[model samples]
Target: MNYATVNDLCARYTRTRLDILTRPKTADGQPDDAVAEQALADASAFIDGYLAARFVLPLTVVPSLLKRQCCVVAWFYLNESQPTEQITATYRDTVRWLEQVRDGKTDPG
Candidate 1:
């Protein structure tokens, strides 16, 4: 199951950026739900790749931390163009954090 949605990304980031990012896929200056949905799904998939080693699949209650990372990862997937230094760094950091959690080196607590 997906931890985030297009609306989540919009809330965390901005509708303007989402509009711009999905515009090419939509072929219009608007957000396409399908494209955004795919990216969000991919984000969840990546999270599961790490999380499955520890936590259960299809989480029952997503934590605040996961929610925030979900959006960050989803934004990274949506960014087909060059990611800014901030985005790249944050996404890399997010993955590292997930890896830490998976390896039981750190907990979300």
Candidate 2:
């Protein structure tokens, strides 16, 4: 399996999600946790389902695994939901996790 491909897929999925969540009116129209949780689940499911259909193993297992992290991170940053400490911690932790992944020191489990 290509780790690069997996990483790229995660990055693309995250970017797509960020685009939607950061759009104007996204805040005014929806509850923060509800939107964040749903978006994370939807994006992760899309990645998992698509990869599974193509017969990939690791990537197929990644959705539920990664979605946990996504939800935690998103919950911390959503406008109405986030506390300042949580937001700061979430940003720090996420950056550290990504660095570990890049250094091949961690796996999603």
Candidate 3:
């Protein structure tokens, strides 16, 4: 299951911005929720790849930190195109946290 959702992204960023991110994949000229869903799913899978090395796969209850981290990664995945330096930095920072989780230096709980 995805740790985050379109609502989560919309909460962190503006829906209008999501419209732009989801724009390229759509032809109807309206924001597509499916693309957001896929982005979140891809991000969730990426996180599981790191966390599963230590913990069991797909935690029954997702921690809030994981949820937020998933949102950050998913936001980048939605970019599809090249992300801005600021966005890349934020994504890189988030991945560093995941590295900590993978190496058992930090806990998602």
Tens-place lDDT digits, model 1, residues 1-109: 7888788888988888788888877655566878888988888898889989998887778887887888888888888576788888899999999999999998754
Top TM-score model: 3
Best by lDDT: 3
Residue-level lDDT tens digits of model 3 in 1-107? 78988898899987989988887778887779898999899999999999998988768899988889999999888875867888888899999999999998999
Q: Count the backbone clashes (under 3 Å) in each candidate.
A: 0, 0, 0
Instruction: Provide the global lDDT of candidate 1 against the true structure.
Output: 0.83
Q: Write the per-residue lDDT of candidate 2 for residues 1-109, one digit (tens) a residue.
A: 2222323323644645444544543646542334444545544443344345434456544544465555554444443332577556865686566556545576665
After TM-score superposition, what is the CA distance of residue 87 in candidate 1 from its true location, in Å? 0.8
Give per-model TM-scores. Answer: 0.89, 0.44, 0.93
Error of 2 at 100 (Å): 0.5
Clashes of 3: 0
Q: lDDT, candidate 2, residue 19? A: 42
Q: What TM-score does candidate 3 reach?
A: 0.93
